[PDB]
Amino acid sequence: SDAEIIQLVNAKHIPAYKLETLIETHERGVSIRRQLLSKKLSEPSSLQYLPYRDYNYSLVMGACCENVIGYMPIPVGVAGPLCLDEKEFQVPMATTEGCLVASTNRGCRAIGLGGGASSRVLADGMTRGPVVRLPRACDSAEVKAWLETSEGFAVIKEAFDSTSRFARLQKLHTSIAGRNLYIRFQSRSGDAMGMNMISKGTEKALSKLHEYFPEMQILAVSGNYCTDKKPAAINWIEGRGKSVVCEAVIPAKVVREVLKTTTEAMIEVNINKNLVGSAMAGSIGGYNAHAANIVTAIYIACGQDAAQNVGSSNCITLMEASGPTNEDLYISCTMPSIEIGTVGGGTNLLPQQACLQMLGVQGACKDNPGENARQLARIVCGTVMAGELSLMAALAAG
Amino acid sequence: PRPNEECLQILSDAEIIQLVNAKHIPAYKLETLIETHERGVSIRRQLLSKKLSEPSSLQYLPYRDYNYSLVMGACCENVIGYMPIPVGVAGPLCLDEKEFQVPMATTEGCLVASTNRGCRAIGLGGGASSRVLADGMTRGPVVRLPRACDSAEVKAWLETSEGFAVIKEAFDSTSRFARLQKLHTSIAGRNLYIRFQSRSGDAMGMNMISKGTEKALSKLHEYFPEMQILAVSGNYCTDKKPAAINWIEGRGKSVVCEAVIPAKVVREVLKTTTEAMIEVNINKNLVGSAMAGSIGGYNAHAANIVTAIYIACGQDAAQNVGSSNCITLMEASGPTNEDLYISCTMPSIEIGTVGGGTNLLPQQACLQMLGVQGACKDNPGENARQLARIVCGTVMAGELSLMAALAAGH
Amino acid sequence: LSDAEIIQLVNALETLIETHERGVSIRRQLLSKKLSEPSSLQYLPYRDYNYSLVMGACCENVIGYMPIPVGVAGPLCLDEKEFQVPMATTEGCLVASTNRGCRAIGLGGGASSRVLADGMTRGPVVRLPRACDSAEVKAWLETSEGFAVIKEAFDSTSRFARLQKLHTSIAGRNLYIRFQSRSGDAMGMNMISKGTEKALSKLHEYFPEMQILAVSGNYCTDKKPAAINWIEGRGKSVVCEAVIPAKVVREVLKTTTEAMIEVNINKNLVGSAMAGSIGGYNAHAANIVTAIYIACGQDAAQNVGSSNCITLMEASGPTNEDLYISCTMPSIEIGTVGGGTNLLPQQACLQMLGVQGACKDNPGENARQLARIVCGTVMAGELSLMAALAAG
Amino acid sequence: PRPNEECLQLSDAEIIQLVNAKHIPAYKLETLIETHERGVSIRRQLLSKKLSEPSSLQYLPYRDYNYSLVMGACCENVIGYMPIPVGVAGPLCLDEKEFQVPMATTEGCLVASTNRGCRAIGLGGGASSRVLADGMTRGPVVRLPRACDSAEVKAWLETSEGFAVIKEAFDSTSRFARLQKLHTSIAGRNLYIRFQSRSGDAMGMNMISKGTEKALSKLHEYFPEMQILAVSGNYCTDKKPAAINWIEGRGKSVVCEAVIPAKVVREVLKTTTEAMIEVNINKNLVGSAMAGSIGGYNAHAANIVTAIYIACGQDAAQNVGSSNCITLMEASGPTNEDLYISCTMPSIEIGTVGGGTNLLPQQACLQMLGVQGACKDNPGENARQLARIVCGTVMAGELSLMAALAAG
Ligand SMILES: COCc1c(C(C)C)nc(C(C)C)c(CC[C@@H](O)C[C@@H](O)CC(=O)O)c1-c1ccc(F)cc1
Ligand SMILES: COCc1c(C(C)C)nc(C(C)C)c(CC[C@@H](O)C[C@@H](O)CC(=O)O)c1-c1ccc(F)cc1
Ligand SMILES: COCc1c(C(C)C)nc(C(C)C)c(CC[C@@H](O)C[C@@H](O)CC(=O)O)c1-c1ccc(F)cc1
Ligand SMILES: COCc1c(C(C)C)nc(C(C)C)c(CC[C@@H](O)C[C@@H](O)CC(=O)O)c1-c1ccc(F)cc1
Ligand SMILES: Nc1ncnc2c1ncn2[C@@H]1O[C@H](COP(=O)(O)OP(=O)(O)O)[C@@H](O)[C@H]1O
Ligand SMILES: Nc1ncnc2c1ncn2[C@@H]1O[C@H](COP(=O)(O)OP(=O)(O)O)[C@@H](O)[C@H]1O
Ligand SMILES: Nc1ncnc2c1ncn2[C@@H]1O[C@H](COP(=O)(O)OP(=O)(O)O)[C@@H](O)[C@H]1O
Ligand SMILES: Nc1ncnc2c1ncn2[C@@H]1O[C@H](COP(=O)(O)OP(=O)(O)O)[C@@H](O)[C@H]1O
Ligand SMILES: Nc1ncnc2c1ncn2[C@@H]1O[C@H](COP(=O)(O)OP(=O)(O)O)[C@@H](O)[C@H]1O
Ligand SMILES: Nc1ncnc2c1ncn2[C@@H]1O[C@H](COP(=O)(O)OP(=O)(O)O)[C@@H](O)[C@H]1O
């Protein structure tokens, strides 16, 4: 019984996190971990409203989380339809910020009444940037030159690509800092965000490189040159994951009636807030109003890694006068580094798979690998554009 | 399935759907038409379900038994259910002579485990110490004057003791927690960006600062009638976008944390040496981030910890953008210089224990678990400050663990 | 003694020898023997130059001087005055294009400028045993009493040294302190350093465990790009503006207001954004800043931060066909006394502008006037080059 | 003083009379007169009357200078020249050679401190350097009607075929115009294209601008709807701080290194290896990080770059990006008491042919280094050698100044 397992565990031997190994059932393991934790709290009843029952923990234990004590429910709203590339999407948004889903929905409506939005994927490739060290800068220079010859690259590419069917080493960007050499490996990864896959490829590639340069020390599989989950100019300038651009034209009438403002007022706010304002703040990649809000809500709803909102949110929002009389609104959003996937990680869980299915991009695209992930990136870029339209109209109106 | 003329009373499921499609009523008004909250949701799902390519795609999206009462008109719209995020626990975290059991909402494997290991190394080292260096949420509107000479005049005016006092009075009249601290202004030709900074009790303070800013700008307008208020936010805050200003001047809570890990613990718990950790920290977190052209990203993975705690505690997760700013430093310490000194400095943790998502019960549970839920009666803001310290300490545990693993390499 | 005699004595200068010009001749001969082209030095000038002002103040191991052509652009109609701007450069068409920009402004009724802030900085890095201690020092530095004592100590070092504010930043047990102060008409580097050393010494008396790691911890920030100079300013922060009549844009600049605006937005704002620029939202401020700095005896290496600029353009007037233009430069590091401004030729260029030496009546006014002149000339430079790009 | 309508054959005051009468612009004095120095003397006299103190130009030299090289090439409305003291630091032991480095500056102790740095390196066995990349850039901004079109152009430019045709049109403009990679970036319907190419021993601006013009003209044939907004869209990026130059390089990317024996650090630099390291990490790495620097992880590279640039006829305004540098220091040797130091400079914009290097005095400083003009047999080698020299001198400068800060 629980009372029995509790005193057996209190007898040090087994730690609270070794409950999924002993106890013959997931949910009970959680209940037992909770009771044990409750007694260590200044308020033993604090867990009362934290849910944990009837959740499919089979897919979570040993793949997505440890020392599980329940789950956190995030309200999921829906914005749409989003008319993108001649299709209609109903976008799931997990958030606790009031008016976010509503304002984004309004943005979607303005786009719909404007004939829809168009998007293009400009680049696709997840990255990993390890740091290695040579005895001297002259040696690291030699390695860089070697990696730059067609023969050196081919050897590394072969080693990298042997690790998986989706591992296709695209290019290599190397940077030297004295005797240190940072190597940025880039590769597609089917419909997976590709972090783990690229890591495996990187470890195999660095090993092959160690044979030709035995004096090379592999300091860290990640030397922050990726760059993963930290702001960096490199992701903005060279891209990371999926680089996407979206656009739409909003008829003056729609700007007037749906957005409650004018094209001229929107343009003036965009230039002075999103361009000049971000410039005065010393921003690198943050030339937008609130891309992070949309990226985050969709990421949580679709099982993405929410911490990747850091670089995935990079965006430059542009607005221009358009049309016969210059009263129509041209708008574009360019996002160079959307880190996303429809396979693996949190996308392996059922509730998040439901939101992905809702968009028609769940799991692998069997006939065209990577297409589901690309479609999801396009959807994110389009929804961000709807979000930018709506919030900017509100700011422009006062 | 009764006809529409009869259905105008106060009925059946298929009938509401037929009344919705017929009288063209937007799905978002379902909360004001049906009896429960859960049924408004169920109908919305049913309406939504026909507009899909896979009508059964919502099958596993939970929606039943959720307390929508607190969500409606406050946290979300067009609700079709909720998304469960697994919550793990890392700890105890020995911080400032207390012990914390940190809730972490995540779907990334080994994150909670590695962070837990980091907590253990710290506990064995005698614990961590933290300090709140600054506290003040900001809002940075952009106004325009006819000429740069006029915007310069406004800037100078805002810089006199009398001008500031007038603005501070106007700003502070809007709320009991609104305490205008300072003003940072920047000019770009005829544009003037004004960064208002103020404490806000235990609330993250976005809404309170906006109200204060609107009252202050209105007052400023009385002194300079030719001033045009272009946007209540001119990106000079800066909210949810990377910016050097948050890194250099801070935003929300600026915090520093530190600990010393005995060589023995580095060896046995972290599976490496102090010397290897230091070498990885310098060449990855300092030199690597420098080569990548990073502003404020001199850390290994602060964003992972900040995000997991933010989701579990009802914070605004989109604020992970600036809240994640962190510089992690490591150095040789002790008699033989073999013990590991580690510090994490986070200038812009945007956080709160009142309002927004913290008004929901499940997230209040995670906040209670930390002992920082809601307002602090006897010392306003203390709960939010305590939460920021906890976030900074957990990030440091996360940095310790991940760096040890990278240092041990293979 | 001959020259080959003194040379032989050195093997087996201005201190030993009597003449200044002779000591240079000797050094040139001594150095001549180590080069693989000893004749190369024949075209490097050295005679008829008074090394008196240079020795022990501006340069060492002097082997001559480098002549930089000085051109003149103007008149520059700024704040109801007219300036003839000296520009030392070797880049063809720079002076000419800048002159054209000046003409467009003159025809537009002139330019207006304002100095928004004035204060040179020095940002030393100190260390405490623990982050908790550095936090304590920061808190103390932010109290009115703590600032008062540091200020008293800083200001006691010179008549001009006046401490304005303190910006402190923590990195674990490290504490970076940015001292900002006016400095009369001097660029103020040396003066601020003296003040900083006296202030840190005083701070040490309150916190004996504090280690002064370096008088400069790169938090100033001097001669390296940094967001801190852009956001908080350094030296003189200046804004300049003008309106160019549609006719002038058409006839002098050979383009239209609409084309200029479109180039400014997509080049200076969007382009600089795509490039990941911090403070480089302009076309070529560095060209003007550098040419004037060399001609006026400023420290040319300071072109790094001094060049920070955001150039803005918009439609103005009744029919919205006139060109409104502004340039905002947050960190112009400049001076009219000390350093290279102590030399006669550079003093001539400063006199040409009417800002040489100290402004006895109001210290700092000459330096402020020079900063305004630099900002206005940059604006003329931006107008001209942008017109050329908008046209083709 | 003869009458105006007589003089067309005359004195100084006669030229003045004519100019002030017909409102003939001062820059015309070059074509108007027959000589050069007299055109300068007349411009000064004319200018002197437009000054609040007509005696201003008294100490600004103009006599005995070679204006033939300047006129129509380096400067306009010339009123004289500005003398910048030139000091010498060295020998600089770099790659088994010895260099005597010319430095034009007015900052006291700069040459001296740099000289000390050179001595510490010499006594340490010298420094080694490598050129990692070479390629000047120009980054124009073009516009298409829609983002979908600009994306099509980007994709087209990325094919081996599309590139070849671009490389052709670009290369056909010069002997040295040899186009390497293309880096494109999209911002909605805007497309920024960064052309990168070697340029022999020339810094490369004009050369690459020409290639870019012909490449864009070529691209306009495949895309008639493409509008060339500006030959430079700030994506180069030239003379403005930018992360792109730091990350992708511009001009010459160079790395330099040396090891300084503990004894030398102690006796010449007056400090210890341990103190130097501690200052480097907390000033050049952490300090620059706290300041929000992009590419400024050094103590004073700009000082050395500027002094050498002025002395060698380089474009001094290029000190903005050319100064980018990350200075690194670490414990080395058996006893781990020796000082390892490296400086990495990704974007040194330099040349030994063209611009100010066409003038004699600056050619003297270039000859002093043995890199003047074109390298007949190995094009670009002189410019590369100059970049290595700059990187090595910066390293000497960093060593010396850091030692002084460490000692206190
Ligand atoms: C006037 O309110 C505008 C508004 C709206 C409306 C569309 C309902 N929605 C949101 C939300 C519901 C989308 C936010 C606030 C958005 C916030 O998350 C991000 C924002 O702070 C980023 C920035 O612009 O700097 C703001 C809003 C934005 C900035 C303000 F100062 C005040 C209010
Ligand atoms: C070798 O594995 C190290 C490791 C561990 C271990 C402590 C379990 N946990 C995580 C996780 C579970 C904490 C991550 C990966 C962490 C990832 O989210 C952020 C990381 O990418 C940040 C960065 O350093 O750039 C990595 C890991 C880090 C860098 C790699 F290249 C590969 C794997
Ligand atoms: C078509 O020529 C434009 C022109 C002019 C004209 C005003 C004579 N002058 C200069 C000079 C004489 C001012 C430069 C070249 C200016 C150069 O120094 C800086 C510039 O490169 C900064 C930038 O805009 O990125 C350029 C020019 C600028 C960019 C080109 F691509 C080509 C030519
Ligand atoms: C204590 O003097 C150190 C010293 C020396 C010595 C080699 C004589 N030379 C120079 C000169 C002569 C090389 C400078 C001053 C150097 C200055 O130009 C750049 C410097 O400011 C960059 C930085 O370190 O942030 C400084 C110096 C540097 C920083 C100070 F705070 C004070 C003095
Ligand atoms: N509660 C809500 N849920 C979803 N969308 C909403 C909500 N409120 C407003 N919207 C969006 O905002 C737009 C504006 O609606 P509203 O404020 O009622 O003004 P109007 O009647 O003038 O359109 C709607 O078309 C809808 O897309
Ligand atoms: N079409 C596909 N795209 C991507 N991954 C696929 C596909 N089909 C199968 N897979 C499998 O899924 C893995 C990616 O998921 P995972 O290992 O969780 O890593 P990550 O979440 O870091 O991308 C691949 O290594 C491969 O085994
Ligand atoms: N599943 C897990 N959940 C939580 N913490 C974990 C988990 N696995 C490991 N840890 C952390 O990692 C530390 C290392 O334990 P383990 O991997 O068994 O190695 P060792 O037995 O060599 O110490 C533990 O003290 C704990 O803090
Ligand atoms: N060599 C020069 N020196 C100084 N200013 C010049 C020079 N050439 C042109 N300018 C300036 O540029 C403007 C352009 O004149 P010019 O080159 O003759 O072309 P245009 O008359 O076709 O506009 C003039 O107003 C003048 O101020
Ligand atoms: N009006 C003035 N403004 C500034 N400095 C002045 C003034 N009058 C005299 N001075 C002197 O000139 C010195 C400034 O020159 P210097 O020490 O070389 O420093 P800087 O680096 O600022 O040029 C001051 O210390 C002071 O003795
Ligand atoms: N070896 C060489 N390398 C480069 N340029 C050379 C060489 N030999 C002759 N030249 C000529 O010198 C020019 C370089 O000077 P210039 O056109 O002013 O351009 P820049 O100074 O901007 O590099 C080249 O365009 C070419 O005509």
Bound chemical compounds: ligand 116, adenosine-5'-diphosphate
Order of helices and strands of chain A: HHHEEHEEHHEEHEHEHHEHHEEHH
Helix proportion of residues of chain A, in percent? 40-55%
Rg of chain A, alpha carbons: 25 Å
CATH names the topology of the largest domain in chain A as 3-hydroxy-3-methylglutaryl-coenzyme A Reductase, Chain A, domain 2
The first-level CATH class of the largest domain in chain A is given as Alpha Beta
Distance between the termini of chain A: 63 Å
CATH architecture of the largest domain in chain A: Alpha-Beta Complex
Family (chain C): Belongs to the HMG-CoA reductase family.
Modified residues (Phosphoserine) (chain C): 36
Protein name (chain C): 3-hydroxy-3-methylglutaryl-coenzyme A reductase
Subunit structure (chain C): Homotetramer. Homodimer. Interacts (via its SSD) with INSIG1; the interaction, accelerated by sterols, leads to the recruitment of HMGCR to AMFR/gp78 for its ubiquitination by the sterol-mediated ERAD pathway. Interacts with UBIAD1.
Outline the fold blueprint.
The structure is a homotetramer.
Chain A: H1 2-10, H2 19-22, H3 26-38, E1 68-84, E2 87-94, H4 100-112, E3 118-128, E4 131-133, H5 137-148, H6 150-161, E5 168-177, E6 180-188, H7 195-212, E7 217-220, H8 233-238, E8 241-250, H9 252-257, H10 263-280, E9 286-287, H11 291-301, H12 309-312, E10 315-322, E11 328-338, H13 350-359, H14 371-397
Parallel strand pairs in A: 9-10
Antiparallel strand pairs in A: 1-2, 3-6, 3-8, 4-6, 4-7, 5-6, 8-11, 10-11
Helix pairs in contact in A: 4-14, 6-7, 10-14, 11-14
The structure holds ligand 116 (4 copies) and adenosine-5'-diphosphate (6 copies).
Residues 174, 176, 199-207, 351, 353-355, 374, 379 of chain D line the site of one adenosine-5'-diphosphate (ADP).
